[PDB]
Design a protein around this nucleic acid. Structure first.
Lengths: 127, 184, 66, 35
RNA sequence: GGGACCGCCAGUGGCGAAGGCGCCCGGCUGGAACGGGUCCGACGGUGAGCGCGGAAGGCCAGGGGAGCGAACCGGAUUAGAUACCCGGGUAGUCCUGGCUGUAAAGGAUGCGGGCUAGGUGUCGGGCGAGCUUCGAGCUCGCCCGGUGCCGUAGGGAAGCCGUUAAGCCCGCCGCCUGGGGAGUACGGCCGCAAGGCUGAAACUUAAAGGAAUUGGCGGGGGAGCACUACAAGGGGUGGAGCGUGCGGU
């Protein structure tokens, strides 16, 4: 029978991590980050790495018998930012175009009802 | 390589949902399949696309060779759907209750109501009171499984809207999320 | 040379730093995505019907804003 | 500590907070010298 | 397992004397509106002296400590960096019992009564209609009370206000008398302490200060431009010599 996986995508403003797991999500099947593929620290969160590393994970996932996958995109959330990093949709195109069937795409960014105080002091990050 | 050491087990639903095939999972040992949770939409159970928003969490408890059976640990509506329903110039009423079933199952149930316009608070309290009464009554009348089924059906929600129209017309009454606390 | 020729069907408008670069719309005439419409970038003057060569069909240009 | 708001328009002078701190430090020292 | 906080619904909403107050339920309690003379009969306004509670931060005694983060410790930046940026990090942030009586605590508008064109919304209560799948539902007008916008006359240096006055009258305290010296010296009182309340003098100075017009300028915003701007392409100087001239001998 057709097998379904779950693609946890975690795209910050500094990196992007693609982690493909089973339907129960308890088994790490493919786990490729932006740092694996580019040697410059500043290019990790780019959609280019989110393309390339995502395809590198996708082919291995196809090799291990999984053809279909759902997507779960997670911005850092919590007390951190809420907007997904730029490369999330790029990686989504990666999985779609690398042969994987795409099922349900839902967001799983952890939103706090009332959480901790954020970082940087009262007057914000005075860049 | 450890992947060659794995094996794939099939999983089913609980009986009251028909025990339909849901998926397969790789695992080294059958004991490692115990205490595993799977999230599956209601369209993937009944095939109805109107209830894709609904999601059901099944907790695995039985491993019979390659067969794996599961119980109903929780349910939750889609956060996208919840976000869509909520809108400005409207009042969101959240009612959280702890309930025992007729067979003794323990549950925490959270129900949402949305009205047409901004509304006075006491009217919202009356709405909460009405639906408190009705779900308490159904908890004492129905057993655990049929209660789960009807809550998923939305018949309770529609009846609740009918009863709460006597206080204010509701745009939509619904059940958002349910968590099973304990079992008898 | 595994290039993918595609045909210019519409010009979105100038973009990029200097404005020299032009945002274009191109139809994929061959390959695995035959008939697909793509927003792409061009360097050098362009017309309606230029056979732009693609190294990849995966890249789609970001929407330009005003 | 009577506070004249007019002393807060920063032209030709320091931010009033810092002169206030300076003078307070001076007061501490002078009282300590007398004990 | 732990601590903190109760997002969306949220808005000029609402309540409170002010600071301030937001998850749900149960209880105790303050206050007001609205509708009724339903009772009493000027019992009122203001308040020197007095009293009361009153954001943060700091302090005293004991607990607590998730994140955050004064001081401090490193990484980085820079001519120099005791900072901005990054990694840490104590006090504090929380609970109990006290102190300290503080802020651009600002509507920078002390409080009560009478009058003075208007239109318009929202909030709550009442009234009259109409709709109603019969709701503490839905549409229009009015009265009351609260709260915004526009705006006539009028006011004001103007900015602007204009029945929520900063208009005209009637009541009561405080506060002000060129800038600085100064919120200092001295004295007194208060507080455990930081420090709070009160507060001059000599001397110095031709102004300080407020609104608004024009320009100039912005490492503000918007629009239109290019060869003294650039993208594409080409040519070419400063390396050697010499012509010419500038500075210097």
């Amino acid at each position: 029978k057709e097998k379904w996986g779950i693609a946890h995508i975690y795209s910050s403003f500094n990196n992007t991590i693609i982690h493909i797991t089973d339907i129960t999500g308890a088994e790490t099947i493919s786990r490729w980050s932006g740092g694996m593929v580019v040697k410059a620290d500043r290019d990790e969160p780019s959609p280019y790495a989110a393309m390339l590393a995502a395809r590198r994970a996708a082919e291995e996932a196809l090799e291990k018998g999984i053809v279909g996958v759902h997507i779960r995109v997670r911005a850092p959330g919590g007390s951190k930012s809420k907007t997904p990093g730029p490369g999330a949709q790029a990686a989504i195109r990666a999985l779609a175009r690398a042969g994987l069937k795409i099922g349900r795409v839902e967001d799983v960014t952890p939103i706090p009802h009332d959480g901790t105080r954020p970082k940087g002091g009262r007057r914000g990050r005075r860049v | 390589d450890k992947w060659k050491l794995k094996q794939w087990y099939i999983i089913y639903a609980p009986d009251f949902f028909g025990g339909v095939e849901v998926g397969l999972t790789p695992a080294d040992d059958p004991e490692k399949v115990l205490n595993r949770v799977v999230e599956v939409t209601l369209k993937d159970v009944t095939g109805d696309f109107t209830k894709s928003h609904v999601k059901l969490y099944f907790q695995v408890y039985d491993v019979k060779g390659q067969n794996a059976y599961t119980k109903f640990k929780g349910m939750k509506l889609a956060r996208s759907y919840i976000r869509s329903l909520v809108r400005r110039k409207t009042t969101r009423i959240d009612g959280i209750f702890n309930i025992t079933t007729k067979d003794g199952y323990k549950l925490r149930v959270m129900a949402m109501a949305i009205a047409m316009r901004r509304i006075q608070t006491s009217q919202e309290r009356a709405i909460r009171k009405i639906m408190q009464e009705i779900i308490y009554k159904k908890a004492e009348e129905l057993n655990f499984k049929d209660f789960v089924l009807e809550s998923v059906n939305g018949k309770i929600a529609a009846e609740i809207a009918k009863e709460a129209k006597k206080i204010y017309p509701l745009r939509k009454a619904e059940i958002r999320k349910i968590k099973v606390l304990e079992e008898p | 040379d595994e290039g993918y020729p595609a045909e210019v069907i519409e010009i979105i408008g100038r973009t990029g730093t200097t404005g020299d670069v032009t945002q274009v719309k191109v139809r994929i005439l061959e390959g695995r995505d035959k008939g697909r419409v793509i927003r792409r970038n061009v360097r050098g003057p362009v017309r309606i019907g230029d056979i732009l060569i693609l190294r990849e069909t995966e890249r789609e240009a970001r929407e330009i804003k005003s | 500590m009577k506070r004249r708001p007019r002393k807060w328009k920063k032209k030709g002078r320091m931010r009033w907070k810092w002169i206030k701190k300076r003078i307070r430090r001076l007061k501490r020292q002078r009282k300590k010298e007398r004990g």
